[PDB]
Every structure is written in structure tokens, then in C-alpha cells.
Amino acid sequence: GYWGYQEFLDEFPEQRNLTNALSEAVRAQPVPLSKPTQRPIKISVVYPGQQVSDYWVRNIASFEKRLYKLNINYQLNQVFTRPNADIKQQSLSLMEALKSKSDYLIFTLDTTRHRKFVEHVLDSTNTKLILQNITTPVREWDKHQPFLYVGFDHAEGSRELATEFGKFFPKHTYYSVLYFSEGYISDVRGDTFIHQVNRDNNFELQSAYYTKATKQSGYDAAKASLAKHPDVDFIYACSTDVALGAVDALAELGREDIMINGWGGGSAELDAIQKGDLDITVMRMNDDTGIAMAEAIKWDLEDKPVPTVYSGDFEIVTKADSPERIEALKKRAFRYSD
Numbered sequence: 001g002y003w004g005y006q007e008f009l010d011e012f013p014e015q016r017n018l019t020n021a022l023s024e025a026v027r028a029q030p031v032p033l034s035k036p037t038q039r040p041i042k043i044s045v046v047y048p049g050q051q052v053s054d055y056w057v058r059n060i061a062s063f064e065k066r067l068y069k070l071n072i073n074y075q076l077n078q079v080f081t082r083p084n085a086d087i088k089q090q091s092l093s094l095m096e097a098l099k100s101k102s103d104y105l106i107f108t109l110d111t112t113r114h115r116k117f118v119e120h121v122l123d124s125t126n127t128k129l130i131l132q133n134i135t136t137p138v139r140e141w142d143k144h145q146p147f148l149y150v151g152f153d154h155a156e157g158s159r160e161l162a163t164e165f166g167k168f169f170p171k172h173t174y175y176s177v178l179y180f181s182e183g184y185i186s187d188v189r190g191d192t193f194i195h196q197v198n199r200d201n202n203f204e205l206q207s208a209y210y211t212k213a214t215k216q217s218g219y220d221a222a223k224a225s226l227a228k229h230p231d232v233d234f235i236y237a238c239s240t241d242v243a244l245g246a247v248d249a250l251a252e253l254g255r256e257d258i259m260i261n262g263w264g265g266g267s268a269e270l271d272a273i274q275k276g277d278l279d280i281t282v283m284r285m286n287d288d289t290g291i292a293m294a295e296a297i298k299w300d301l302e303d304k305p306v307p308t309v310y311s312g313d314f315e316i317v318t319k320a321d322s323p324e325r326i327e328a329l330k331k332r333a334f335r336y337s338d
């Protein structure tokens, strides 16, 4: 149903050129809008940003700062909901975004819920769509893909974590998984990890629980999983809030021996890493996606071609890392968001 990130870029060489060009623009110093818009642009954001994870909040912060440094006049309406919830608000806010004739509508997709909405925008409106936290183009939309898919590739991050656990434990190691809520994130972060680990190290999956994408749910799921399968050496978590909940569970059960990962490397995760509560995590160079979105909008306003997809990079972080390594990474990742 989805194109792999590299698979997409290899299939369409011109897309790889565009993506590489955006990547270079993101790292290079700000080159302000060459053509001033006579109307400030209207931007609407609908993000499942109400979480312990600071990804969404930092994304808007870095995004707005880059828009500022690029001299782009804009009006931004923001709506933050909780993941796996607030279905009504999400629906009402998305419709309101189109009603207000926004120039750019930014949101995410984890379920099939808003696909028809996307199709409507693409076929009958002038509103451009930016889909955050997804870097795998939807095949059914090959004839007309959204303006931009942006994020930190889930498959890559999960492969990096899988490689690490593969080196930390011997063949046939017992483990359990804590998924996100049912959907895309669980599929691309969870099943990717399970597949590689089982295929390359013959690890033995003991259980895999779907969650409600919250810390409380991660805690509840970890306890349930360990009650039925205490003989595991590690637990792979598919998201920040869930992993932090699992941490609390391990502490309560006195099972600090069990390794647990974070997924994303935001401030709460890094604090847990330095505390030793989280053993490892794949840290994304966070602000790069917010910056990429501002650059993409800039190119659009300059009538330049914009890549269909853009994925930022990751850095593996462990509790054994020195404070200098952590500080150096924060300097890179939160250069704009602070």
C-alpha cells in the first residue's frame, strides 16, 4: 500500500534530485523568499500534538522560526489533539481548514480515516497538503500525490534499533513488543523491527500488545505483558509516551534488567536516557523537518518544483553516551526549537 522511502526515490530519479536539493537547503543558511506574496499565506495545522513527546510542538516552533528567517508573511491556525482520540475535533478542524480556504493544510495520517478527505483536497481545491510524520507515499495516489510527505522515516529508525538489539543479544533472545494504537505507526515501526530481528537473529517474539498511544496505556500493557511473559530480555516500544509508561512498569516490577527503547529522542526521552531509565533510542535531528516545510513552502511561492517526500536523519543514543555526545546532538536537533 505504501512506497518505501528509498524505493520511491529510486523509482523516480527526479524525486531523488528534488529531495537531495531540499536536504541541502535545510542544512544551508536561510536564503529568504525571492518573490514577496501580496497576501500573507494562510496555514492551518491539525496535529495529534497533545502528548509527552515534544515532536509536534517542536516541529511547529522550528517551522515558524524558519518561515520568519525566510521572510514569509503568514497567518497560522493551530489545533492540537491527542493521538488515538478526539476524532470529532480532528474531523471538524480539518473541514474548517478547507472552509477557510487555507493555502497550506498540515496534518498527519495513521489510519484510513482521512484518505477520502485528502482525495477531496487534491481533486477539487487549491489547498496544498503537507503530511507530517509519514515518508512513505501512498501508492493509490500515484497520479496525484500530496504537496509534501515529511518526517523521519519509521522503517529506517526501526531498522537502526533492530540492528542495535541484534548486537546486544544472542540468537533466539526472548522479547515482547508494545505497539502504538492500531495503524500505520504500529505497522512501520513495529512490524519492521519484528521482521528484521526474527529474520536476522532468530529472536523469539513472546507477545505484542497494541496500546492507546498514551503513557498510562504503555504502563498497563507492559504490566500485562510481563505478567504472562516474564522471561523476556527486552521490550521494543513503538513510541515515546508508550516507552515512558513501560519504564514506570519495569521500575514497579523491579525488572530494571529488561532493556527498553525510546523512539524519537525528544527532551523527555533524553532526560530518561541520562537518568538510565531508557536504555537506547533512535534520536531524530528534530528541527530539520520543520525547516524543510518552510523551505518547501518557499520554493512553492517561488514556483519551483518541490519534492514529494523528505526524511530527516537519525542518531542512535544510549545510556552509555557521554553528556558531551548528548549535548552535541541536542545542539543539532533543537537548533531552532531550543
Ligand SMILES: C[C@]12OC[C@H](O)[C@@]1(O)O[B-](O)(O)O2
Pocket (backbone or CB within 6 Å): 048, 051, 053, 054, 055, 056, 083, 133, 185, 238, 239, 240, 241, 263, 264, 265, 266
Ligand atoms: C511523532 C511520534 O510518532 C508517533 C507519535 O505521534 C509520536 O509523537 O511519538 B513519537 O515521539 O514516538 O513519534
Ligand SMILES: [Ca+2]
Pocket (backbone or CB within 6 Å): 119, 122, 123, 144
Ligand atoms: Ca483523485
